[PDB]
Amino acid sequence: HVPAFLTKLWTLVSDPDTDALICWSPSGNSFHVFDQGQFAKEVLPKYFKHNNMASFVRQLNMYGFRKVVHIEDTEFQHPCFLRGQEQLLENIKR
Ligand code: NA
């Protein structure tokens, strides 16, 4: 059993029709969320049935996702959340 959240998240990231707001990084080892306000207003209701970024991020945290930042516009990642590898979602837990 792979949690519906992860399957939906993988499909959403991979969808080219949504890449303006959420997409894979070039290497496919992480994903980006652009325009958080628009993302929460437009994408989250359609795919996750709410409009709250904090709730979305809480789910990411629950599954052990990390945030990627520049060394001294949000990038999230999990070692088993990879482009073209939906079958690896089975290894994500929590
Ligand atoms: Na996408």
From Swiss-Prot:
It is found in: Nucleus; Cytoplasm; Nucleus, Nucleoplasm; Cytoplasm, Perinuclear region. Residues 2-94 are annotated as: DNA-binding domain. Phosphorylated. Phosphorylated in unstressed cells; this phosphorylation is constitutive and implicated in the repression of HSF1 transcriptional activity. Sumoylated with SUMO1 and SUMO2 upon heat shock in a ERK2-dependent manner. Changing residue 9 to A: Inhibits HSE DNA-binding activity and transcriptional activation. The modification N6-acetyllysine is found at residue 67. It comes from the Eukaryota. Functions as a stress-inducible and DNA-binding transcription factor that plays a central role in the transcriptional activation of the heat shock response (HSR), leading to the expression of a large class of molecular chaperones, heat shock proteins (HSPs), that protect cells from cellular insult damage. In unstressed cells, is present in a HSP90-containing multichaperone complex that maintains it in a non-DNA-binding inactivated monomeric form. Belongs to the HSF family. Monomer; cytoplasmic latent and transcriptionally inactive monomeric form in unstressed cells. Homotrimer; in response to stress, such as heat shock, homotrimerizes and translocates into the nucleus, binds to heat shock element (HSE) sequences in promoter of heat shock protein (HSP) genes and acquires transcriptional ability. Interacts (via monomeric form) with FKBP4; this interaction occurs in unstressed cells. In unstressed cells, spontaneous homotrimerization is inhibited. Intramolecular interactions between the hydrophobic repeat HR-A/B and HR-C regions are necessary to maintain HSF1 in the inactive, monomeric conformation. Furthermore, intramolecular interactions between the regulatory domain and the nonadjacent transactivation domain prevents transcriptional activation, a process that is relieved upon heat shock. This is Heat shock factor protein 1. It comes from Homo sapiens. The gene is HSF1. The chain holds residues 15 to 117 of 529 of the full protein.
